[model samples]
Target: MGSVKVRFYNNNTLSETGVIYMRINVINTGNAPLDLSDLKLRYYYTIDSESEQRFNCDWSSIGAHNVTGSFGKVNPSRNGADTYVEIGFTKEAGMLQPGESVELNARFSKTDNTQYNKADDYSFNSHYYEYVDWDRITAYISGILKWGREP
Candidate 1:
């Protein structure tokens, strides 16, 4: 299995709202073994709400990025407060065996309660929500680099 996928696990927040947690599944869904370099993933935060803002942060604020191989240097909007975040791998993070799936924990800290809310109605839409792109991961199967494909 050589397919890798990213999944966001909800119900994974600390007492404080700043610490946002996410689970990354290094899942191999193909018959062949998948190397870390085989796939290039770009993670970005976007808001559907008309009133959303982005900011720059250091590694300390990006949270602890623990992965089997490379956590990659997070390149937040170089253009300043853009809605895109790019993951730059400083080192090799490892690989996934066939029919195997490894989980990665990511701590993302976004500061700003004025723009975000837990939702008084407990509804999904009413609350202020900043979302990371999980369903839009661009899966590159090694040696096939596409221009602008990398965020």
Candidate 2:
């Protein structure tokens, strides 16, 4: 088994809605190398607009081409969490050495380009600037929950 840690912070300061900005750092804390293909991270939040959503990985230490993302609507819709962005990686990402991290700059917005609110978003933190250990974002390894609690 491998161990991992997640650091996160909000990148958008201009507004809480319209476009949701996030910077996430995924760290390999285990003694062995961690396969990026086996890892996934879920960022929980509510969708404010009715139109289809869009995802963008602005940048990534592991190469933007290796990173993948998609939106999923939560069943039953938990508090402050109706939708989530499932961040994934391809085999091209290879392995992550222990103590090494991959930083990903990601964001999402409605196709209609309308404003949305993040004040009640489950994984959103307006005060987070620099990366910090955050449990709101859940991590999964091989489809098994590895870290954080689900909303």
Candidate 3:
């Protein structure tokens, strides 16, 4: 899963509480088509903010029409993690051919007090641990969920 890319507009938000948008880009970089339904993707992240409300969270897709997945999150007080999230899809959805990509948009917000600084971070893969660099370090894909795209 080298072609799939997870990126945020990452325009940079300075406020203690605000909205954030990210593009989870899925691509078929292989010679053959890739079936998203057969894949189970687990997404985990923690924004600078502290909460994800029902109204502040939403997702939509560009090339994908029908999307089905589970969503979850942890809090900021955990030891091994500050926050967490998980997402997946159903079988009747996407089948990406080579050179094809599916873009999903996420609109969410965070609430903070004061200790949390923008210097802390925007987001990270899996759970937020003591890792120094917040990059596309690539998370643990148990089996089906892989990141791949056309370079």
Candidate 4:
């Protein structure tokens, strides 16, 4: 069992309700082989006022490819390789094997007000949460799926 590195390649400052593309890269640096069958990924966003009023909601997944959707198997021999997967309010698909690496190319488009809120300066804050249970051979991964102003 090893730590998976996740990075949001898009800008994270401004706020908007549009389609945002995310690229996720997973690498298995452990010596033993890993099986990612029960592994799942989840994502969402939250907005809080200076007074500490928390406004949070779960972002929707597009089509049949939901965030928790199944990702095929990944071989152990192939490591450090990037696999592409897409996610939004619809569908998501990818896979990772022991000692293998995979990249997920996903798209998250804001459909409603559940994931976003308005502020004085429109300075919205969000975070992404990834859940994984290696013991159960199943894990859930999620994050603050939002788009900021591009610099």
Each candidate: what lDDT?
A: 0.39, 0.86, 0.43, 0.32
TM-scores of the candidates are 0.46, 0.94, 0.53, 0.38
For candidate 2, the TM-score is: 0.94
Model 1: residues with Cα > 4 Å off, grouped in runs = 12-16, 47-82, 87-92, 110-134, 141-151
Backbone steric clashes in candidate 2, count: 1
Candidate 3 lDDT, 9-111, residue by residue in tens: 3433455445433445555556766666554433344444444333122454533335543445445344333444444455666676778765555544443
lDDT of 2 at 61: 92
What ranges in model 2 sit over 4 Å off? 14-16
User: What tens digits encode model 4's per-residue C-alpha lDDT throughout 1-151?
Assistant: 4334333333333454333334344454545443343234332222221121121213322213334332222233122111112232222333344556554555433335233232211111233343222121122334321222211
lDDT of 2 by residue, 49-150 (tens): 677988898899989888888989999999999999999999999888999988888888888888878888898776657788889999988887878889
Colliding residue pairs in candidate 3: 1-147, 2-147, 3-148, 3-149, 4-147, 4-148, 43-85, 50-111
Q: Rank the candidates by TM-score, best first.
A: 2, 3, 1, 4
Best by lDDT: 2
Runs of candidate 3 exceeding 4 Å displacement: 1-3, 39-44, 47-65, 72-81, 109-119, 122-142, 148-151
Clashes of 3: 8
Candidate number with the higher TM-score (1 or 2): 2
